[PDB]
């Protein structure tokens, strides 16, 4: 088998202290198989023991609060880098109420915790999009980056 690897990067701005939190946790799986891996703190993933496939595989990237991404035609005739640190796979945050669509329901969930601060009764880390310690308009604007998007809106 071979190794299928790459890097993933969420589509929003964040500082150095939170980088390890926002780049980890993306599950990458080869559709139709039991092969998969989850990105580490550097946004890096590596699937091993992958059988060759001249007819590229289809990969699916998922993570709570993010919009599922499907990438087809990933040819594997040896060890292959799906992406690189220099040119990582982007993932869009905002699919909070899971339904494969960034819409008003998602924004409403963040609004429910508007102005909540770390340690407060109404603070939920997952809703603190950029993880800076407070839930506010800055987080909502990030979700707005891809308002209206569904999985098919990702570059094919």
């Amino acid at each position: 088998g071979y190794k299928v690897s790459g890097y993933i990067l969420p589509d929003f701005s964040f500082d150095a202290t939170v980088a390890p939190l926002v780049k980890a946790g993306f599950k990458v799986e080869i559709v139709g198989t039991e092969l998969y891996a989850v990105t580490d703190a550097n946004g890096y993933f590596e699937i091993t023991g992958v059988p060759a496939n001249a007819s590229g595989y289809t990969l699916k990237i998922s993570r709570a609060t993010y919009l599922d991404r499907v990438i087809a035609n990933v040819v594997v005739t040896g060890d292959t880098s799906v992406s690189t640190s220099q040119a990582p796979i982007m993932m869009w945050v905002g699919d909070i109420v899971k339904d494969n669509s960034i819409n008003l329901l998602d924004v409403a969930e963040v609004i429910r915790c508007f102005n909540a601060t770390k340690g407060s009764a109404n603070y939920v880390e997952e809703l603190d999009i950029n993880r800076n310690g407070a839930i506010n308009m800055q987080d909502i604007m990030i979700v707005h980056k891809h308002f209206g998007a569904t999985s098919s809106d990702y570059d094919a």
């Binding site: 701005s13 407070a134 800055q138 909502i140 990030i142 308002f147």
Partner: protein, 166 residues
Amino acid sequence: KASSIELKFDRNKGEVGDILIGTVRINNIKNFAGFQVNIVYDPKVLMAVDPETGKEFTSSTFPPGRTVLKNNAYGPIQIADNDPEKGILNFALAYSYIAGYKETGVAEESGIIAKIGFKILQKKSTAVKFQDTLSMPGAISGTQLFDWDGEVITGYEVIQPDVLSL
């Protein structure tokens, strides 16, 4: 020209019961698409009220009178989370569909974003202004402006009003 956000009052003096109108506006904010501000005042001297009707501001009251971000085609979303008893106003507004807005190739960069009425409760010198708060880390003196790419805007001036003497 100069990029800024400012709070200004129509009048500097008044009688008990008179409603002073504070106009918040932005000037030359490149690719402007949204905002959030935190404004504080002394609740025992002034009372936040609708500049038009004259209805008292509550925690969910969003200020009227804006001349920008009114195009329904981009789904403007307004949010209010004030605390009148503590003399705090905190509200935000932004287009949800900023991608569609950017597609027009022309941004709304100058205009009014809020009109707030302040009823005079006492004949005393008082001040109101933008002020940082724990719920807005990294803000510019209690203000955060965003562009149509969903990023925070920096480098603009925050012009404080007041010096309301009576």
